[PDB]
Design an enzyme around this catalytic site. Structure first.
Site, PDB file in Angstrom:
ATOM      1  N   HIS A   1     146.941 107.391  43.858  1.00  0.00           N
ATOM      2  CA  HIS A   1     146.709 106.697  45.419  1.00  0.00           C
ATOM      3  C   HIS A   1     146.948 107.712  46.263  1.00  0.00           C
ATOM      4  CE1 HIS A   1     146.794 103.508  48.396  1.00  0.00           C
ATOM      5  NE2 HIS A   1     147.903 104.288  48.851  1.00  0.00           N
ATOM      6  N   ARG A   2     145.846 108.080  47.048  1.00  0.00           N
ATOM      7  CA  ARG A   2     145.873 109.000  48.007  1.00  0.00           C
ATOM      8  C   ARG A   2     146.520 110.292  47.834  1.00  0.00           C
ATOM      9  NH1 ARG A   2     145.289 104.270  50.989  1.00  0.00           N
ATOM     10  NH2 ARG A   2     143.417 104.010  52.191  1.00  0.00           N
TER      11      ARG A   2
ATOM     12  N   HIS B   1     142.769 110.379  55.254  1.00  0.00           N
ATOM     13  CA  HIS B   1     142.753 108.813  55.634  1.00  0.00           C
ATOM     14  C   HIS B   1     142.717 108.543  56.966  1.00  0.00           C
ATOM     15  CE1 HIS B   1     144.132 104.815  55.071  1.00  0.00           C
ATOM     16  NE2 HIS B   1     145.373 105.101  55.482  1.00  0.00           N
TER      17      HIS B   1
ATOM     18  N   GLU C   1     136.609 106.172  48.583  1.00  0.00           N
ATOM     19  CA  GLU C   1     136.448 105.077  49.256  1.00  0.00           C
ATOM     20  C   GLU C   1     135.735 105.550  50.598  1.00  0.00           C
ATOM     21  OE1 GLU C   1     140.528 103.698  50.431  1.00  0.00           O
ATOM     22  OE2 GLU C   1     139.615 102.321  51.873  1.00  0.00           O
TER      23      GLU C   1
END
Lengths: 382, 382, 382
Positions: free
Chosen positions: A155-156, A197, A250
């Site tokens: 995750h990220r 992000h 994403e």
């Protein structure tokens, strides 16, 4: 290689009642490579296990009659399907009809039936003639897809243990056992892509302002992360890792065709997508359904995931309609009933923002197919 | 790879007399990979040597006329053939007609002709237009089939030198030079297959009773051959030899679909038949023609042999009609005339129960393609 | 491998005005491997870069109407093209129409449009139905062709440094850096081919008389070149060099089908042409256009060059019409304007009989793609 397919033909004339649809009970086989036909089910051409796409075609010959119309039609699983032939025309003499299908996807157990229809007075004879045949051909065969039954996502960049969205973080996540690395991208003042992000770089980097306010070079040179690490662009990450790693990407919730176009161009430039790419080496997720549709219209082989926080049967049905590979609901909304329902529909379920071992174990018991975990080693502690 | 095929088109309009069938004398070539067309034979598309299956298609464009019917037809070797297109329809304006064939087998020297027919008043013009073309495509190419010009079979495990139907016997036969091992199979009380010749096990094994009276496990555990060797099942033999050996298999004279279904499932499980198998690695024989037809309808690539004791032209014609690979007549009924006749028809002749060197030499002089010999080394003594 | 292609279909019915041709604005994609369709250009199926040959097909479904005719047509680059489907038929009920194209060549940027036409009263509905689709398939993909941007030919064996048309001369030319060796062939009294330039052997060999006056064996045994070297036949040269070297071959100006037939048979026997050959490993030139056409009709993959001394736009247009690979004008007639014009048309320009370094440099500045030089090392002296 060697041809894979089958062809069947009639040995005795079949009688077609007026104005009634009738699958043709084919009686003998001209050739059949491997189990494409069954004696107890003559009307069906069956697709064996090791086939993904097929081509179906046939021809018909009727008895001499110059009245009414004749029909040639092919059905999949007893119902209409995309890419199948269909023909109607006026009848003169025998009025032969020929048709051929395009390349269409299939799965084990699917069958095709030859349907005939006539509108002439009295019955008509579906003559058993060399010009009356039913054939199916195999175009694509099953092969290793690099897919995994369970997928663990970093995750990220696995920021729980180090800095977020940096080459060092991605490498650490891969070392800890991450199956996929997650990338968040935004456009700079130039068309280039920057891996971040938040829309504003102040939270993650020593700089400030929107990513699109200034060029990529200035952002990457004059600014660095709070830990002093470089701010890598998409090209830098792709060069560093290349094809060794599988990427999770994403897109922006606010849809913008330029972002998707640039991402697709960059990915194709490295061969990660397209003709020479591996199907599951890249996965793309997005809250915007329009972005997923746009990507699918250009690269249908790329698996797609839909991010949502309202896990429900309606969302699963919508995703199935558009052919998305997986649905990514919030972990708090997941239940074994919904996971089983998704598996019945054929969709994969990925829980995102899982950061506790107890919740991870509960989700594993629920059968969740993957997790986006900020902390990775907890999966080994199960 | 690279595309193999050809396409031809007209350069000047051809005149088609009313109500007469006429092959189209195509004049120029759009493209031709290798010798698919000949100037002195314009009407024919010729299949070169290195092709096994082809696909043929074409299109037509007539002059503006809204009377009568138009025909599109393709002939093989000047006569009708399976899998070729055929179309008739009412004519409006130019009334173009298009058709495409399925994948069909061919051999060197075969040719295809484009036939046209019209039923309008006066002559019609077969226009030379980009929408008027004749094309042939190559789907399958010749490759090594593992076939041999002469085949020596270890008749029922070469029992002349050791025990019959056992792994040791098969290995000894292979060592002595057997090209194919012969297997006789019967169903036990369970669906499993046992390797034996007689229906009752008393003749060959210490046990007694029909093979189907008891389960496979009891038969294989409590009983052994008269020489004390194990009674191997089909699965055991396949595991022991795998793909290293080519198998000859015989089915029951009394036809039973369950036997064939189980045999085919077992063979496919090991990859000896089907998509990934070699054509000639397995050969199946049977006195029952129905069993051969049933096997062919499911696996057309498996060569089939017909066992008979009444070698005659009628049997050879019947076998040719059903497409059997070979005919296995009794050696006493074989003559050079019949062998030559079979070779002219394209069938292979195998003599079974040959156990004398003089008879073997006589049959070799007759040109017999294979022998089922209980004694193998006599072939080396020739 | 994996299937390469795309299929598109409508999501809402399109209205077709009476008696007007209309490309169909397809709205959604059933599947698309790599960039075969564009949202801003719905009517076009676009061929990506890495494709050489494609197959296109489609199907149509209209609203129920039994008046007028319906048309199915596919256009390439907005105009007619060879190998595309075309169909017109009387309309009953929905009157579905199906068509499929043959294998046709394409290049990057080419697009195909689905054209529809109806002749019924009022407008007609192009229904969005599973039986209404547009598909394109990729048959051949781009691969290394062994071609070079610049080609240096050892004009007639590089006789400037040694004897002409002999194995030693060819080997010396290859050592000096010749990309292609030039062969001149004539028929002897037998059908065999002899490597010589002049029709009479007195100029080049100790013998005398026409090459066809006596058999190959006598000529090759009783006679030798003025330097005492053997007079090699085509078979000898092919055996000595095989596939290690790329050959340039010239045919007789006086056309004779026997010469071309023998040359093609000899070349195919060694695998230098045909299915298993490399495209650019052999190049054939000729002053006779008929010989080039005859060779093309049999082996379309063989590149062809046209020799001329009247370099002009008419000759370039004629060569482009017949699809010749290159044009070989006399060096004295070459100018940068003509070279640029040839490059715009897609033809390669080779200057023959270049034997001076200054002229060679001038031609290189003009952009000439190749030279037939009797002296080879001058190219290195540039």
């Amino acid at each position: 290689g060697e041809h894979i397919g089958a062809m069947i033909q009639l040995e005795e004339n079949v009688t077609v009642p007026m104005r009634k649809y009738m699958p043709i009970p084919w009686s003998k086989v001209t050739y059949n490579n491997a189990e494409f036909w069954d004696s107890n089910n003559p009307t069906r051409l069956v697709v064996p296990k090791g086939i993904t796409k097929v081509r179906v075609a046939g021809n018909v010959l009727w008895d001499s009659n110059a009245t009414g119309q004749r029909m040639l039609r092919i059905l999949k699983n007893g119902t209409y399907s995309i890419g199948l032939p269909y023909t109607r025309d006026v009848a003169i003499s025998t009025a032969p009809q020929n048709g051929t299908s395009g390349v269409i996807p299939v799965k084990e157990g699917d069958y095709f039936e030859f349907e005939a229809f006539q509108d002439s007075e009295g019955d008509r004879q579906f003559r058993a003639d060399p010009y009356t045949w039913f054939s199916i051909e195999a175009i694509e065969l099953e092969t290793e897809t690099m897919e995994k039954d369970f997928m663990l996502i970093g995750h990220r960049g696995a920021t729980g243990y180090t800095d977020e969205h940096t080459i060092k973080g991605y490498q650490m996540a891969l070392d800890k056992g991450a199956d996929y690395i997650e990338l968040d991208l935004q456009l700079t003042k130039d068309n280039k892509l920057l891996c971040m992000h938040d829309s504003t770089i102040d939270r993650t980097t020593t700089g400030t302002g929107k990513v699109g306010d200034m060029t990529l070079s200035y952002i990457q040179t004059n600014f660095t992360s709070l830990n002093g690490e470089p701010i890598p662009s998409l090209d830098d990450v792709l060069n560093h890792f290349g094809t060794k790693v599988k990427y999770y990407i994403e897109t922006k919730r606010p849809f913008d065709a330029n972002m998707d176009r640039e991402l697709l161009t960059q990915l194709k430039a490295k061969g990660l997508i397209g003709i020479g790419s591996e199907r599951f080496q890249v996965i793309i997720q997005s809250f915007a359904r329009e972005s997923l549709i746009n990507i699918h219209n250009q690269f249908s082989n790329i698996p797609l995931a839909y991010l949502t926080s309202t896990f429900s049967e309606s969302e699963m049905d919508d995703c199935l309609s558009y052919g998305f590979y997986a649905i990514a609901p919030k972990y708090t909304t997941i239940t074994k009933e919904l996971v089983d329902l998704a598996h019945s529909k054929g969709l994969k379920v990925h829980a995102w923002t899982v950061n506790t071992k107890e919740e991870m174990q509960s989700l594993i018991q629920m059968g969740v197919d993957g997790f986006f975990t900020n902390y990775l080693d907890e999966y080994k502690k199960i």
